[PDB]
Amino acid sequence: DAEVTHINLNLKHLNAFSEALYRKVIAYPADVIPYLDIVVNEVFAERFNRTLAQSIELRPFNATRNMRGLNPNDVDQLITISGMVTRTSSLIPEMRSGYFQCAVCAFGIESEVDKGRIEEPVVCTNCSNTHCFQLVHNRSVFLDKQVVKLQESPDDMPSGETP
């Protein structure tokens, strides 16, 4: 109705439904989140017989710890912490797909950026020259990114620690 594009997923409800799925969500967020999204989009399309401008996106919340209690075991796991916002940065463009153009015959190719890396074409399939393409930056596609700085709450801490 209002064309909202996200769902806030309260994880306590999921834990009440099934702990066997809650454990998988918290243990592997970088692998399972790209598919629970697709289940939500499938159910939306089946229910309303309709498409939208962007995919409906998940936001899991209400999974609590302290900033000092983190360990190397917690890398790539889901956590939640709290604090005060002191500073925010200006926006950074982050590319997802580049656009190459041949210098000799103006042919043009797209190329996805993934795993942090782009792949450059070597041979032009039209004019059959080699080491020939140039990236055109403003014909390519970007996304927003922002940095936020967060500060410890002073209440919980043991003796002698600064935030």
Binding site: Y28, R96, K115, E119, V141
Partner: protein, 656 residues
């Protein structure tokens, strides 16, 4: 040396805006320049210095526009202008640049000629030379003519040929395909002067034969950038309809952009990971396949073919196009050219062609052969498409059986020389073969049009006897297989192959009708000559050879940019072997299944209504039926046999 050129060049005069002012000793300065050009060596130093100083644009053409210019001043100016407007290969004595350093000098000569062409976008120059032409031909009787004026008139005519044979220029900017060319502005000035009527009047005279070949060359070079389809349709417009049409065009563009961007931005996914495809083996031992992006489903996997660099053919064996600067000119230019074509057909064509055909193949010079075949092809296609049936009397020089005979002789000689020689010489002879083939195709189509739509039964009988001769004699029936077996992309263009496919299509339709009406039953064959029954399926079976079907699968890859006629011709030739000879095993082939895969991917982007509305639906439907016939009895050994071209006993043993 070149201090003499620099002394002579700046001593002529200066162009005020709207007026050229002359020094009194222009005559002796031009004599000295001609003397230096005569004595120039293989370095062409004086010629290159004249090209640096831009004599033709700055001085000589504004000088020729002057009213006070006397006889000798005009004469020697025309002499120098002809010598400077000579083509580059003619300056290099016919040899192409065979060397890294020779090419530099060739390019330096060529750019000076390309720069000079915009000097002739003014009607006053053609008006100035038209008076000298009129003085010799119209105002002087044949008993009283002077050899000095004869030589001057020959120089003027050769100058017009050299002007219209200049190449286009890239340095001025890039121009769209739907506006007037820079060639068209010279054409507008030339036609506004009205000198073309004098040239047509000269061409009509039987007595003045030595100018006729050059006048034929001039009119071919005028029609160089056009096609008959541009001029055949009468021009009309209303601006209301034009505004509505352009708004719908940009509506298409906007909707395409929005759909493409939303699809692309919806494609992306947020996070990563790495995954194993259990059930697919890796290169190293005991390994499963591993992927490093969140794949939707296992069939989306590609084995990283996007990385791998494509293999290339060597530089001697790549396909090449031949580019003619071709555009949809404005309604003004198209109307002027349509009137000129009709006037040529009414006043010149029969006499000009009759005078030319005795001489064009005897001469030392090569290029008039190409001009001859081009003008034949253009005029006959224009008559047939414009349906100006009363003009059919005027082109009666080309309708006889002798036209087919002479064309076939010249085409055969060109094909043999192009196949047997090597290099640029082989490409040069193949270029002649292309134009000869196009003229042959127009001959066939024009004779069918006469036999179908003429009002006089005598004309219908005359056309029918020629058509029967073509269908009967072996030389005309064996020609397509003979050319196809000798085709090679090292020495023949893609335009040649497209032309050959269309020619084969029209010829085979003619043979099918003459069999269906029963007019072809028995056929003469060489041994002595003996007569044997003819079978159309036996004739069609010759084209099922692998050495023919290679090129049809080769040209079917370009389906997304071919014309609809060419797509129809390719699909029809495959459809005959598929469902008239009823032999699908010869078409079961992987390199054709790749084309079907591309067509299917192209059709995925359309709704069920738009698919039936599309222009590629014939190719889609043919691919559907052949693939269903293949998968009706699928086996693994059959899938192995799909990897190779299958000969006759291979087809028998696979079938039985």
């Amino acid at each position: 040396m070149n201090v003499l050129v620099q002394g002579a060049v700046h001593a002529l005069g200066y162009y005020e805006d709207g007026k050229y002012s002359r020094e009194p000793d222009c005559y002796e300065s031009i004599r000295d320049l001609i003397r230096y050009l005569r004595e120039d060596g293989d370095d062409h130093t004086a010629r290159i210095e004249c090209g640096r100083h831009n004599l033709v644009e700055q001085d000589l053409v504004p000088m020729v526009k002057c009213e006070d210019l006397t006889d000798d001043e005009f004469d020697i100016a025309i002499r120098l202008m002809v010598n400077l407007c000579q083509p580059a290969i003619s300056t290099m004595r016919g040899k192409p640049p065979a060397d890294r350093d020779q090419w530099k000098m060739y390019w330096e000569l060529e750019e000076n000629l390309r720069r000079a062409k915009t000097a002739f976008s003014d009607a006053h120059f053609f008006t100035a030379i038209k008076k000298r032409i009129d003085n010799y031909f119209i105002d002087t009787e044949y008993e009283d003519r002077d050899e000095r004026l004869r030589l001057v008139v020959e120089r003027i005519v050769l100058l017009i040929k050299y002007v219209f044979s200049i190449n286009p220029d890239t340095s001025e900017g890039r121009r769209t395909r739907i506006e007037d060319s820079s060639h068209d502005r010279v054409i507008i000035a030339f036609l506004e002067s009205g000198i073309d009527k004098t040239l047509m009047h000269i061409a009509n005279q039987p007595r003045e034969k030595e100018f006729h070949v050059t006048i034929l060359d001039i009119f071919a070079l005028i029609l160089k950038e056009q096609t008959a389809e541009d001029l055949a349709t009468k021009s009309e417009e209303v601006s209301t309809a034009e505004q509505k049409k352009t708004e719908e065009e940009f509506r298409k563009i906007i909707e395409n952009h929005v759909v493409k961007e939303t699809q692309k931005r919806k494609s992306f996914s947020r996070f990563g990971g790495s995954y194993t495809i259990k059930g697919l083996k890796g290169i190293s031992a005991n390994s499963s396949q591993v992927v490093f992006k969140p794949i939707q489903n296992v069939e989306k996997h590609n084995f990283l073919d996007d990385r791998k660099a494509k293999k290339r053919a060597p530089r001697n064996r790549r396909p090449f196009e031949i580019d003619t600067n071709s555009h949809f000119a404005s309604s003004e230019v198209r109307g002027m050219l349509r009137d000129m074509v009709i006037r040529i057909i009414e006043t010149c064509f029969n006499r000009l062609m009759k005078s030319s055909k005795t001489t064009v193949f005897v001469q030392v010079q090569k290029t008039s052969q190409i001009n001859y075949f081009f003008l034949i092809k253009f005029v006959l296609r224009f008559v047939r498409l414009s349906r100006q049936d009363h003009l059919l009397e005027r082109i009666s020089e080309c309708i006889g059986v002798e036209a087919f005979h002479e064309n076939n002789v010249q085409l055969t000689e060109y094909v043999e020389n192009a196949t047997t020689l090597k290099g640029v010489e082989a490409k040069s002879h193949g270029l002649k073969a292309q134009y000869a083939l196009g003229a042959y195709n127009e001959l066939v189509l024009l004779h069918r049009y006469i036999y179908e739509h003429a009002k006089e039964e005598n004309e219908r009988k005359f056309a029918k006897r020629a058509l029967e001769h073509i269908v009967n004699v072996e030389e005309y029936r064996e020609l397509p297989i003979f050319i196809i077996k000798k085709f090679s992309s090292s020495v023949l263009s893609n335009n040649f192959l497209r032309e050959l496919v269309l020619t084969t299509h029209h010829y085979m339709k003619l043979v099918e009708r003459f069999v269906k009406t029963g007019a072809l039953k028995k056929v003469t064959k060489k041994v002595k000559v003996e007569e044997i029954d003819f079978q159309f399926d036996s004739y069609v079976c010759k084209f099922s050879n692998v050495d023919v079907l290679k090129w049809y699968v080769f040209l079917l890859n370009d389906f997304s940019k071919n014309s609809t006629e060419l797509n129809q011709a390719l699909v029809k030739m495959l459809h005959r072997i598929a469902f008239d000879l009823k032999l699908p095993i010869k078409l079961y082939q992987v390199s054709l299944f790749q084309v079907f895969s591309k067509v299917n991917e192209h059709f995925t982007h359309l709704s069920k209504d738009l698919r039936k509305s599309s222009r590629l639906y014939e190719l889609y439907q043919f691919g559907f039926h052949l693939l269903k016939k293949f998968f009706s009895k699928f086996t693994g050994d059959l899938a192995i046999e799909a990897l190779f071209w299958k000969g006759p006993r291979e087809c028998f043993e696979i079938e039985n």
